[PDB]
Design a protein around this ligand. Structure first.
Ligand SMILES: *[C@@H]1O[C@H](CO)[C@@H](O[C@@H]2O[C@H](CO)[C@@H](O[C@H]3O[C@H](CO[C@H]4O[C@H](CO)[C@@H](O)[C@H](O[C@H]5O[C@H](CO)[C@@H](O)[C@H](O)[C@@H]5O[C@H]5O[C@H](CO)[C@@H](O)[C@H](O)[C@@H]5O)[C@@H]4O)[C@@H](O)[C@H](O[C@H]4O[C@H](CO)[C@@H](O)[C@H](O)[C@@H]4O[C@H]4O[C@H](CO)[C@@H](O)[C@H](O)[C@@H]4O)[C@@H]3O)[C@H](O)[C@H]2NC(C)=O)[C@H](O)[C@H]1NC(C)=O
Ligand SMILES: CC(C)(C)c1ccc(/C=C2\SC(N3CCCC3)=NC2=O)cc1
Ligand SMILES: CC(C)(C)c1ccc(/C=C2\SC(N3CCCC3)=NC2=O)cc1
Ligand SMILES: [Ca+2]
Ligand SMILES: [Cl-]
Ligand SMILES: [Zn+2]
Length: 804
């Protein structure tokens, strides 16, 4: 209830929300049905349109007009955005040549360049190039300011999760908006797109930009707009606020357009009906920039043109139905569409079993257009598991397809031709970023980046300290002329030990055997040099990784590789080696197939043992540095040290062996040498962060050997591939993966075929940023390069997506 007896006279689009039952006059009062009786009359005026006509100049001021063309409108700050063009002979902003904005050019009393965020729903990235002919204003912003060819959304590529990620810099799993529709079991409450539960603040985690501004003394205009307020009225309201006195005028503003998403759903991303929505958006941008020019703010305000997600061709006939796979279709609740989330319908049914649900959905039809996962097995780059609102069972739907429970739900519950929500590396889901203003760079193209990084930049643009978020602050410094936050490398917490030869062979009782007794002071001294690190510059190209947590580990040097061996986890945290383009792949000799050798540098108590692997009928072992890439037969014995061994399921050894025997050499051939850092990851609570020792849920049977949940590799080479990886002078090139360490290959429907048909596809799906691996390991990479730290931060956020 609201007693709407107050008036909006002199209160239109007020910046403070008043307390009930007093009626409201702010730009959101419609969505709460709380506007004063005269809000439409006084605030949402429409008479005479939104533009000045030639016969309106100098007119007598009439307050009933939506905007004014009188002589006093500049003083009142309420001219139509084209007033100066029509009445005072000015040019439109799009028609001016663009001149570099070297310094802010602001009117007296502007403490900082304002920031205006022009956000567009469903603005697929390829629109910038394909619609450029009909978007002149947007094309000027893109070409004269700073732009990326595309910006990567977060998963799910849905509207609420991506808009709130932009506002907070957080993964949806962290800010709590994990979909457009959610059920929180702890609340026992449902979050709906259409409804009023979505207004309870308990759903919204993190600290969004408008709260960060407010808490730090930077005034924010109200970012949000009731759908019935026309776009022209939104722009006029923003320009009016920009005419407020200095003490009252906000420094950050937001405009939002429901287009082109609204039409894209009906007509498909490139339907011929999509041209006019693109024209309309551009005209709105033109009205804003014309209005800024009138206020002498067009070389003062920083403008961000940004989307939330793209749009894909999706039709009714391309739907998969769970009733075609399950018998107990009525026992499950499904969140349908471009993703699937499954949970039990009733808690009082213990005859519900997720394992049988997953099995019935796994590789059951040859053309199957979705893949089931337990959420902890989803690719780690999606960062979509660590929230109670994310159901245990997830369906990753192929692009251009939908998943639904029963056919009933589609025809009675085709209309649409477009949709979004798919995996965030899918091209059709990519969206746009353009920055224009004094603080952005001039005519600068930046590489594609993720929308989680924008929050830090928007705080930089406003002089705000960002709340803790998942961006990497400084990785977007190359977007900015000034205001850059200058990051510093984190300090190493644990320094390593450098053990020498301290143990005799007979001190070990590991149950391991090796046929290695076949055995020159020139070459005896030569291999001692290798154990002391004489070849470390060759295999450790960017310095040792820094351990950012308290632990006990040893640096181990070898002819072909270098490792940081954890005495807590009884295995390397990282193994580093360089494979040149000329390097040759050998085989494991027949007599060294089961060879495992004690490391006389590491005590028996801090070593694995072969007996555990013999007894554990589920667990085999593999090696981090591959024996196949040994530089010599004598060096190959190094690769069989017990300190190079890691536990691996036989099913995963298929994946790992093909990567080590075939793919590393192929990458070295293609990239002119590669440097590889590989190691284990433990994330049993799927929070994306390094597990401590007491969080490990699985050990090699009868031992204290922890079982990794994942294995990573970071594959670095020279960006200029005419230079070898080990002699690179300039920027680096990286691709990484975080392979799930699973006892089966059910994820790969073609896994019964040869590894050359499925392993690399699996690895592409689990591509990762170096930053993702740092979170999961507590390690800091690229400590010692000749490149600037900000550039290294950009390299660490890079994701190799394998799209075309
Ligand atoms: C991306 O970026 C984010 C942001 O930096 C980062 O997330 C942060 O991770 C931290 C570690 O996981 C975590 O630190 C402390 O969290 C809790 C409580 O924090 C509260 O205060 C903050 C600040 O205001 C709130 O934002 C936070 O809200 C959370 O919960 C709300 C609902 O409850 C929700 O709306 C909100 O979005 C957020 O939810 C998310 O985070 C929580 C974690 O809090 C998840 O569980 C959710 O699933 C959701 O994902 C909170 O209200 C502290 O209590 C912790 O202290 C622990 O652990 C300490 C470790 O040193 C230890 O000293 C303490 O003993 C304590 O243990 C207690 O609890 C034990 C088990 O419950 C118990 O056994 C023991 O006895 C003891 O009582 C943490 O110090 C941050 O909150 C978190 N921030 C955010 C915004 O999520 C992400 O890690 C990265 N992601 C990547 C991949 O890098
Ligand atoms: C998707 C979109 C349009 C971006 C959006 C929509 C609704 C809200 C609502 C919020 S946020 C909130 N908070 C933030 C932390 C403190 C309390 N309380 C709310 O009711 C926010 C954002
Ligand atoms: C980029 C940034 C600063 C995070 C931002 C700024 C403004 C808005 C405003 C919105 S979103 C919205 N919706 C979404 C679903 C339908 C209605 N209505 C609005 O007025 C949203 C996000
Ligand atoms: Ca963890
Ligand atoms: Cl959803
Ligand atoms: Zn949409």
């Amino acid at each position: 209830w609201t007693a709407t007896s107050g008036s909006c006279k002199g209160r239109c689009f007020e910046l403070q929300e008043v307390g009930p039952p007093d009626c409201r006059c702010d730009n959101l009062c419609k969505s709460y049905s709380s506007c004063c009786h005269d809000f439409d009359e006084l605030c949402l005026k429409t008479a005479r349109g939104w533009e000045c006509t030639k016969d309106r100049c100098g007119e007598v001021r009439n307050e009933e007009n939506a905007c004014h063309c009188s002589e006093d409108c500049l003083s009142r700050g309420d001219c139509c955005t084209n007033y100066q063009v029509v009445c005072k002979g000015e040019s439109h902003w799009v028609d001016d040549d663009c001149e570099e904005i070297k310094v802010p050019e602001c009117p007296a009393g502007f403490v900082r360049p304002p920031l205006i965020i022009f956000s567009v729903d469903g603005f697929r990235a390829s629109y910038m190039k394909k619609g450029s002919k009909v978007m002149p204003n947007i094309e000027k912003l893109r070409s004269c300011g700073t732009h990326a060819p595309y910006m990567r959304p977060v998963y799910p590529t849905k509207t609420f999760p991506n808009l709130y990620t932009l506002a907070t810099g957080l993964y949806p799993e962290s800010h709590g908006i994990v979909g457009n529709s959610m059920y929180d079991p702890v609340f026992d409450a449902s979050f709906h797109l259409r409804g009023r539960e979505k207004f309870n603040h308990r759903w919204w985690g993190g600290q969004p930009l408008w709260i960060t501004a407010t808490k730090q003394g930077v005034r924010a205009g109200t970012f949000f707009w009731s759908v019935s307020i026309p776009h022209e009225r939104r722009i006029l309201t923003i320009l009016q606020w920009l005419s407020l006195p200095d003490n009252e005028r906000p420094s950050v503003y937001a405009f939002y357009s429901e287009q082109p998403d609204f039409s894209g759903h009906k007509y498909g991303p490139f339907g011929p009906e999509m041209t006019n929505p693109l024209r309309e958006i551009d005209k709105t941008v033109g009205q804003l920039m014309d209005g800024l020019k009138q206020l002498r703010l067009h070389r003062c305000v920083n403008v961000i043109f940004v989307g939330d997600h793209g749009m894909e061709d999706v039709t009714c006939d391309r739907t998969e139905f769970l009733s075609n796979y399950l018998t107990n279709v009525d026992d499950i609740t499904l969140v349908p569409g471009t993703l699937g989330r499954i949970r039990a319908k009733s808690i009082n049914n213990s005859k519900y079993d997720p394992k049988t649900i997953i099995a019935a959905l796994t590789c059951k039809k040859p053309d199957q257009h979705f893949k089931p996962y337990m959420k902890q097995h989803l690719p780690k780059r999606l960062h979509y598991a660590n929230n109670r609102r994310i159901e245990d069972i997830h369906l990753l739907v192929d692009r251009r397809w939908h998943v639904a429970r029963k056919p009933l739900d589609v025809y009675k519950k085709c209309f649409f031709q477009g949709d979004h929500g798919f995996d965030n590396k899918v091209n059709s889901m990519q969206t746009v970023f353009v920055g224009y203003g004094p603080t952005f760079k001039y005519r600068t193209k930046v590489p594609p980046f993720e929308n989680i990084e924008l929050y830090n930049v928007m705080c930089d643009l406003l002089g705000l300290k960002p709340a803790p978020n998942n961006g990497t602050h400084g990785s977007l410094n190359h977007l900015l002329r000034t205001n850059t936050f200058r990051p510093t490398m984190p300090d190493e917490v644990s320094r390593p030990n450098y053990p020498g030869i301290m143990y005799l062979q007979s001190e070990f009782d590991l149950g391991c055997t090796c046929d290695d007794k076949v055995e020159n002071k020139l070459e005896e001294l030569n291999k001692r040099l290798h154990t002391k690190g004489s070849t470390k510059e060759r295999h450790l190209l960017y310095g040792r990784p820094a351990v950012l947590y308290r632990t006990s580990y040893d640096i181990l040097y070898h002819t072909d590789f270098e490792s940081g061996y954890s005495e807590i986890f009884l295995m390397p945290l990282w193994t580093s080696y360089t494979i040149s383009k000329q390097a040759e792949v050998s085989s494991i000799p027949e007599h060294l197939t089961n060879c495992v050798r004690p490391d006389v540098r590491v005590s028996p108590g801090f070593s694995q043992n072969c007996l555990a692997y013999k007894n554990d009928k589920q667990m085999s072992y593999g090696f981090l540095f591959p024996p196949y890439l040994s530089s010599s037969p004598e060096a190959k014995y190094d690769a069989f040290l017990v300190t190079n061994m890691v536990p691996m399921y036989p099913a995963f050894k298929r994946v790992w062996a093909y990567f080590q025997r075939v793919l590393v050499k192929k990458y070295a051939s293609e990239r002119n040498g590669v440097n590889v850092i590989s190691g284990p990851i433990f994330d049993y609570n799927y929070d994306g962060l390094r597990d401590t020792e007491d969080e490990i849920k699985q050990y090699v049977e009868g031992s204290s050997i922890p079982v990794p949940t994942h294995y990573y590799s970071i594959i670095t080479s020279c960006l200029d591939f005419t230079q070898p990886a080990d002699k690179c002078d300039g920027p680096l090139s990286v691709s990484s993966f975080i392979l799930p360490h699973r006892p089966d290959n059910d994820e790969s429907c073609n896994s019964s075929e040869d590894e050359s048909k499925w392993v690399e596809e699996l690895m592409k799906m689990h591509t990762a940023r170096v930053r993702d691996i740092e979170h999961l390991t507590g390690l800091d990479f690229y400590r010692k390069t000749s490149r600037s730290y900000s550039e290294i931060l950009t390299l660490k956020t890079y994701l190799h997506t394998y799209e075309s």
